[model samples]
Target: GNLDIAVYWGQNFDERSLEATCDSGNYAYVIIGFLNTFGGGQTPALDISGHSPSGLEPQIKHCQSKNVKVLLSIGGPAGPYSLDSRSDANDLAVYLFNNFLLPPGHSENNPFGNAVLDGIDFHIEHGGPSQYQLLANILSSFRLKGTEFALTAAPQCVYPDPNLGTVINSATFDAIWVQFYNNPQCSYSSGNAEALMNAWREWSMKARTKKVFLGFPAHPDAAGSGYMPPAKVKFHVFPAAKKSYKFGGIMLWDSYWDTVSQFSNKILGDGV
Candidate 1:
């Protein structure tokens, strides 16, 4: 398969802008971000204002019609969030499926209107490992209904990811986009491939999912460090990681930076 490009879409672009991007055929998976913690991780909800039941459905439907997978991301860097208990995790799972997945009986509060998101992404920046696994288990059980729902995670590119390693080991995710920037010990910097490749191989070998994406910052300022030019990604990283059957693709941090940098087009044009 060709590289499966993914990007995070959020308030930086309006719903119509996102529709256009999905329609462009440059992206495979688009993650709607940061369904953050409510009141100290007691509940999970969208943190962005004005993004209600009305605003999201059209964009999701557009992506779905274009064969792009739309997934809701559950955390971000600033989160003081976690599922406090197994019961909390289970309840949150039901809430997510009911509101986000559009299971048969629920409609009154479907955030994406009648559209069911393709999956969930655990951008688990702050959370207990066991609780996330519990949530993943419940979501996985929903697969028994024969609906094609994907589960994925974005963990920082450190071996044995501090927050998610246990969940990555225990849960059955469909894909994982390990963030490969801002970490001096693991990220690619100043053309150094050693730490990044080591982290990539470790993540590839450790993940339950066969598909693992090399996540990048998309621009110089997107992260504190480790922003490789499209040239480096095309000529150096992709070719080197091509050795692994698990080299699924690239994941850019956000739509705005990707557009400004033309990162996706650059790599695709170079035959990455």
Candidate 2:
């Protein structure tokens, strides 16, 4: 199915658990959003909307039972963290591996108890573009320890993402979920999907990732522009976007808006 959805959780403090999100079976990947405060300035921490860290272990493991891929999303528009130096990048990688991936090294500091996540995603919206490759490569090195981590990223639609361009050009992400909603320079306009497709083609050429995802907001109000409604996308936009072999399904902005709009139900069912 080309309906491999990757939805972001932790953007809204809605009353749903990661368990329920995976149980819905609406997504292939559920990314826990924003491990915001990290690096040399501060200790690494999670700001997953408003969910508490008390009982997520069972919830995460529950979802994994269904083969749902869960990942931790680090950095965002509101995050004030950056990997400016190589040492700091290395340190961040180690801390993440110890704290998140199966927690073999730092159980005392493991925020999600002993739950092992699938991978880490770089949603680097405003951090410096420096040394991210070091972080990626460092995490990759952990595979020798028999840790299977799937590296991924989410960059804005504008060609050459300002904060993640260098790393994205150099590293190996399992997928690049490019946000094609917020920016007007390349996002869908009015009823025209041409510009969006053109931009999508540009991304497909050089992402260097296994998959390149076309991301959108689930509701009309979720983003200022790029809201094509499910019907418009079902017939017009999605058809052309999936032509490339790199096309790896869709990435929705969040679960909250999708809950309100039921966009996943409508779009996924109507993928004509």
Candidate 3:
């Protein structure tokens, strides 16, 4: 069978695109962005959706300078990305650790500097019965090599693609962003918060780590009315039973709308 893993090129073109998006100050902003906060040992890692040798190298170094741990998000909701091997996930694991996980240049200022993304976040939107096992084994095997590559995934909340929760026995993820906004069962009226909590509750009860986060949508269209008010986030969701214990904190999708005051009222509601 043919195993397809490459997703985005993540190199020169990607940098040009990001630079344009950030309005000509992409590198400087990367530093500023890193300085803004440390959400965990990890920040919202930029998806190096594509890899580059010339242009992006410096920008990545910029991230390193700020000590912002970045991770190359490999697989997305629809397909595999980068030096990945979804079919033989074990190979993907090996490839990632040996190639992608470390920072690109080992400078005195940037130790372990080689695009050290800290780890990979597997956004697996589709897979089969034995797929989870492959994914898990790959991550686990890599761990034995003394690589602390964080293994995480964004399972689904929809159809056309089966949810990982339904098929996998693997709960070894450093975190699972229990999607709270997109499920048809989601909405302000749908107990979306509670339903998400239940999902985390079920997963955490038996997982190796009890750090599952509530993934919310900054885009209302993405999650419909399940979009929470900042008050709801702080008063209800943040203080909710599940959050009190397993709250790995929030994972908003994009940096743009989620940062703009009007759109991110919920995420930035904490007043930084």
Candidate 4:
């Protein structure tokens, strides 16, 4: 269910460039993560983090025209790009959903007119673990209001703690995807294909989110650094455990690499 026919492109400019970007493909979904650049020159070419960008409104309209709801993703492993603290995150969420998105002059409905975001995804990389609960609290508050906020995390597979899952539930996350490539060990297939199954079981036993996706590197060039083979997928990784249904589905670290190799699509389409 979480198998997003989507991909991520970071740090692109928000002006005229975004239009060309949106028309470049046939993707059903798009996740625009960097809205604001916090001092570091590391802003996306299509950045959206500022209070108001010169061309963001037009770009949002362009996205809506294409039926794409652009999400302003914040925070990553390198630094706290957005949502520095739980309180700030909540306020940010409220502002994004309520204020910032409202039409400029009309000020009645969101800028997109009837077009609004489908949901939000948390792409925090090595973010403050302690702040996770607060993040969850904010997310839960949004969910309670009956707003469908799609809260997802790009967590290191090396650290899929039960707390992560707990936060997923507290926040009423629609999905959770773990980067299996970086984990280095077959947490599922090495010692036992069942190992990965057991880990999912363990996480389920504790947090019980029940919605999990297998995230990995689809780039063949990056395949050696614990890269997963589409052939190594659970349906294939642990063919015996297919009935176990340990994995909800597969996700890729990127679409660019896959687009380059053609292998990326081939494997994803045929491997699993």
Candidate 5:
């Protein structure tokens, strides 16, 4: 079987370009980047109005039609955001379920109009009240509904992430995109996968999810380090990691860098 591909869409999102990216058949998921924090981390909000090609609802629908999961990604490198308390986590869970999950009659609070997103992705970088475990618990509880709402997280490749370690251990995440860049301890730098492979194996053992992806930077400048050439990843990193039972696929840093380098196509070879 071919490896799955996931791309983060933001920074230089072009709807016309995304149409083809979604159609490529290589991508299993396209994560909408960083729903910027608001009201001192009290709530989540997105400026869908600012998206290029105007309305993004149609594009979201387009991706769904292609069987590509579209997820709302929260948090990034910079954020003054996190659940303040266990009560706050539960409240935000209800809010996310109603607004983003869009189970049947619940559509009024949806940020993307009529396009119901598949689920949520936790990119928990900073802003520590340390309550993501509670939020994940609430979201997972809602899975008893007819439809399965996907839950995912992005954690740095340092065994158990300092910020998301507890949530990663305690929650039922479907997929985890472990960022294998920037950190010298576990990142894939200088064509070495020894440390990164060790971390991946440990993560596979610990994750409650069945899917774990090798998150990478699309370009050298995309991150401080751990940017392997497409050839190196395809030949060196992937072949070794693909044997893992939990191996999901690959996640590029962002769409804009991929567009510049054609990294997805180059690595996947024009899809399956």
Candidate 6:
């Protein structure tokens, strides 16, 4: 499982279905994204397309049957998302539990019908840190016996991400998928990969998560720069980064960008 990759499935209109995504054997985790707008009196919205609550339930189960963990990712690289205060954090946490995390109990607003998400990913690319830290705390409070809920994140590869520094330091996530691209300051250089290793060390040591993923843009066009070719990563970066105690695996940006490029298939291979 540690060799598997995590992929974001929403945000791209032409992305494959959750069933096809899991069936392809390329991903171990499928994160439904951009619960785009929530809290601060905004209507909580699920932005993923192609399935309704009823239709989505079975697809989720189909993937879960394969041992693929489906998670709901809150926030996006760009969206109308932010928490006004701790109250706002509480409001969203309650909504998240009732609608996405847990099965119907005291509420009937579950979005995926009987399907309960395995966990959540805080792609907190925007907003202040305090409210998010509180949100994580409240989510952890829902831990019930025999239930395992994964809390993960994707943040810029800076030493301490501005939006998630506090949460990464204070709260615990099973894994933190650090975006090793985008920020040219600490990402891949034109030296045929391995340029991002230094930053990976910083993140592996600084974050409190059990594992840290080397988040990448599967396709060269998927990002501005820091695109590591499959050979470069399989030979250079992966060898070095795998030595880190917190090294988890790779995390692709979006399924659409990855499926065509076949990045995971090359690096991940049959060992998955």
Best by lDDT: 2
Per-prediction TM-score = 0.92, 0.94, 0.64, 0.65, 0.90, 0.93
Q: What is the C-alpha RMSD of each candidate to the true structure, in Å?
A: 2.4, 2.0, 10.5, 6.0, 2.5, 2.0
Q: Tens digits of per-residue lDDT for model 6 on 63-102?
A: 9999999999998877788886889999998888877776
lDDT of each: 0.79, 0.84, 0.45, 0.50, 0.78, 0.82
- Supply candidate 6's per-residue lDDT for 57: 84
Give candidate 6's TM-score: 0.93
Please list the residue runs of candidate 6 whose C-alpha ends up more than 4 Å from where it truly belongs after superposition. Answer: 49-53, 144-146, 192-195, 270-272
Ranked candidates, highest lDDT first: 2, 6, 1, 5, 4, 3
Candidate structures ordered by TM-score, highest first: 2, 6, 1, 5, 4, 3
Q: Which portions of model 4 miss their true places by more than 4 Å?
A: 1-6, 11-29, 35-72, 82-86, 99-115, 162-166, 169-171, 185-207, 221-224, 238-247, 268-272
lDDT tens readout by residue for model 4, 103-202: 2445444433434555656666543454656756665676677765566665555435433544655636655656555444534434344545455455
Candidate 2 residues lying further than 4 Å off, grouped into runs, are 270-272
lDDT of 3 by residue, 1-272 (tens): 11101111132222334323233221111211111111123222333433333344555555546544445554454332222235545554454565565444333222123455555655654444335456567677767777676665555543212545532345566665555565645334453466555554554454344565556665565444466665666666555534345556555554443434344433443321
Span of ten consecutive residues with least summed lDDT in model 2:
102-111
Model 3 has an lDDT value of 0.45
Clashes of 1: 0
Error of 6 at 16 (Å): 1.5
Error of 4 at 109 (Å): 12
Tens digits of per-residue lDDT for model 1, 157-267: 987888888888874888889999989888987779788888887887877777889999888977898888888878878777888877889999878787777788888
* Model 1 stretches astray by more than 4 angstroms: 11-16, 38-41, 49-53, 103-107, 270-272
Q: Give the winner by TM-score.
A: 2
